[PDB]
Amino acid sequence: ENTGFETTLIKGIEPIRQFVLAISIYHLFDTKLFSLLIKHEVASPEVACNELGMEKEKLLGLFRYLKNEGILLETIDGFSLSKEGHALAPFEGWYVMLVGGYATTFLQMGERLQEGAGWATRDATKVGVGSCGISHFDAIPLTRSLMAQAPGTCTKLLDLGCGNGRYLAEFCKALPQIQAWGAEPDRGGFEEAVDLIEKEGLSHRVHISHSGAVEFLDSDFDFEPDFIVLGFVLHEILGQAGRPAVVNFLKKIVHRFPAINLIIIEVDNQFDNAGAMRHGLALAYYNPYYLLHCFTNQLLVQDADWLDIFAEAGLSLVTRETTSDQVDSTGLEIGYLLRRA
Amino acid sequence: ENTGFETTLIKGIEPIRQFVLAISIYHLFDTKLFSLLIKHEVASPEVACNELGMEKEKLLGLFRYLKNEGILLETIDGFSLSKEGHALAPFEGWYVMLVGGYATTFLQMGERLQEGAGWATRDATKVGVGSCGISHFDAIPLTRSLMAQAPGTCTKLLDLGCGNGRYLAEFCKALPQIQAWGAEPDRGGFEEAVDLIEKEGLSHRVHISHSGAVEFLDSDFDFEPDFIVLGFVLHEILGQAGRPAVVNFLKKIVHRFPAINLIIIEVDNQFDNAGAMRHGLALAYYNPYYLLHCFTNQLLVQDADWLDIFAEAGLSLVTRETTSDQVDSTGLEIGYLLRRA
Ligand SMILES: [Mg+2]
Ligand SMILES: [Mg+2]
Ligand SMILES: [Mg+2]
Ligand SMILES: [Mg+2]
């Protein structure tokens, strides 16, 4: 008879309902429909189609789906973002990083679980673009706070793994004397960085290279930085190349630039910490982030493990801070300001 | 200052938290880890790895992620499904169909919105396997109810678009005199059907063909069915081949088999119906289902549109029913029992 089945089904597939909604919100941002709705206020499918080069019947389908979920309103004049839709605006970076960048990674987990199946791949351009959007709220303010605590003033900034160059665009706008260099290994991300720097009118002060971190430090670049920022880059090197390679990379930075100030941002691996994992943001963001990092060739370690790598590399801790508790109060995102020992 | 941002972020990315959970629940079923946990009760990662040929560190990552979400329990002896994990068991078909089958389809929507970009693709094997799992609850009981209302007893059953052959396996077990034939166009689904029929010991009574519906009816098969089941197949033909092709296909069925009883199951397209779309199941399942059908080459129409196609094909409605209100009370899944006019 299946007595009471429907009520259990509606609850049982609530993760699928939200799965489709998350992908649909990601497309709303990524296709530039969200920005179109912000600019137009109300747009007919015909107007949105003409502007973005889209097909009306498919756009109507997406719009009707979002209207049923309350993200859009529909009037005789067309569609608009509802208050709930407008409220999604600050979270674009998270949708672009985790859906755009990592949907394929999560979908590959079943196959990648097999012995010898290798690491899950990702869309590194979207990971970089999304992570740079997120960084406006957490990592850039943390980097700024640590930079201000350093004894020397920043004049020549090097950002390795710069994504779309958001840290450099923000820092250079705020601090007009700075000359900067960024390196980004993903071609798509590198091209977005070159474009963002040009759009911000910073091309005369900021140069971007298409390069990985280790290979950039081995290259024959002429820059003499006094600050180097390593935002979530060391855990990539640690997984890909190993702990000796991370220690050697850090040793090379202070051998080449003995007076340099290093700012490292890392995620403390507390995936196995009961209390930490009950925090709302630990569940919403860090639990999927830790899962991705078991399937990709990156390795997250604990705060104590990073401090031990820094000591082995001959670095001294100046200060360590976490993000503002107004944005992320988990204590899992840690920033370190270091100097040569 | 970003005052109060974190609280808004946790709510703002709740769809992403559930997006990752839905994919992870899908892998738990699809990889056979869910069945392993049911059989073992408690399993160490080492034991699960040896049985399924998996890598321990990746499995531990998935298990830790699911434990943090409350799907698994961890003791010194290993991992087990929690009560919440056990409660997911009946919903396997929905995860396999919508995540396994259609995740790629949803992820393709951004690109497919572009003028001339074509139809989004899907993993038809997983769509078929998942939809057959769902059919145990809604469409098979509906088909059984309509068959019982037909004047003649079923002796030779033809099921077009049979997926993994679940309708035939269920009907033939319940009704021992039946000879049956199934046709499934997806090779993966066809192979699963051949295997399920063999596993159920029905190979002497049930034959499966790797064929689409229209091409099967045009073939030189020797079967003389007295019942034909078209479960969610006509909307595929309607989208792919057009309304005249659907009318012609139905006309061919009753020209070849004048005394045949047809059972058609369709989804009423009420995507634009305010009241219908507020039902919990309309939001959880039908709203994503309607969205997929705007991006794939299938077309959902309304109950009245199907009745008009049946009249044009020279068919008479014997009776029409919806699914049991214990499983799906939306009224959107409609079954029709037809005969030649
Ligand atoms: Mg990372
Ligand atoms: Mg890893
Ligand atoms: Mg369909
Ligand atoms: Mg269609």
Q: How far apart are CA A149 and CA A146, in angstroms?
A: 5
Cα(B236) to centroid(ligand 2), Å: 42
CB A128 within 8 A of CB A192: yes
Residue with tokens 């799906």: B328
* Residue from A69, A75, A109, A281 whose CB has the most chain B CBs within 10 Å, to mutate: A109
Residues of B in contact with A26 (CB under 8 A): 110
Backbone angles phi, psi at B110, to 5 degrees: -55, -50
Q: Is A273 on the interface with B (CB under 8 A)?
A: no
Q: Do A288 and B17 touch (CB under 8 A)?
A: yes
Relative to the alpha carbon of B239, which ligand is closest? 4
Q: Does B20 touch chain A (CB under 8 A)?
A: yes
Gap between the Cα atoms of A172 and A206, Å rounded:
8
- Which member of A7, A14, A16 has the closest CB to residue B99? A16
Strands B156-160 and B179-184: parallel
Other C-beta atoms within 10 Å of A216: how many? 20
- Contact partners, residue A235, CB within 8 Å, separation at least 6: A266, A267, A293, A298, A299, A300, A301
In chain A, the domains with their CATH numbers are: 5-89 (1.10.10.10), 106-340 (3.40.50.150)
CA dihedral B21, A142, A167, A263 (to 10 degrees): -110
Tell me how far apart the alpha carbons of residues B299 and B271 are, in angstroms, rounded to a whole number: 12
- Ligand positioned closest to the Cα atom of B296: 4
Per DSSP, helices labelled H in B69-203 are 83-87, 92-95, 103-107, 109-112, 124-135, 139-149, 166-174, 187-199
Q: How was this structure determined?
A: X-ray
Residues contacting residue A240 through CB under 8 Å, at least 6 positions apart? A297, A298
> Residue A72: which of A30, A95, A39, A41 has the closest Cα?
A41
Q: Give residue B138 CA to ligand 3 midpoint distance, Å.
A: 15
Cβ pair A91:B20 closer than 8 A: no
What value, to the nearest 5°, has the Cα angle with vertex B216 and ends B213 and B220? 165
Strands, DSSP E only, in A216-329? 227-231, 261-267, 315-322
A287, A297, A189, A282: which is closest to A240 by C-alpha? A297
Name the residue among A9, A59, A287 with its Cβ closest to that of B69: A287
**Minimum Cα–Cα distance from A27: chain B residue:** B110
Q: Are B217 and B256 within 8 A, CB to CB?
A: yes
List the helix and strand counts (H, then E) for chain A. 19, 9
Cα four-point dihedral sign A299, A305, A311, A312: negative
Given an 8 Å threshold on Cβ–Cβ distance, is B10 in contact with A280? yes
B60 touching A (Cβ < 8 Å): yes
- Whole-number Å distance, alpha carbon A124 to ligand 1 midpoint, is 10
> How close is the nearest chain B Cα to the Cα of A187, in Å?
20
Which tokens hold the place of B103? 């995740």
> Residues whose CB is under 5 A from ligand 2 (ion)?
A 239, 299
Q: Is A224 left (phi over 0), alpha (psi -120 to 50) or beta?
A: beta
CA of A295 to the centre of ligand 2 (A): 5
Distance from CA of A40 to the nearest CA of B (A): 19
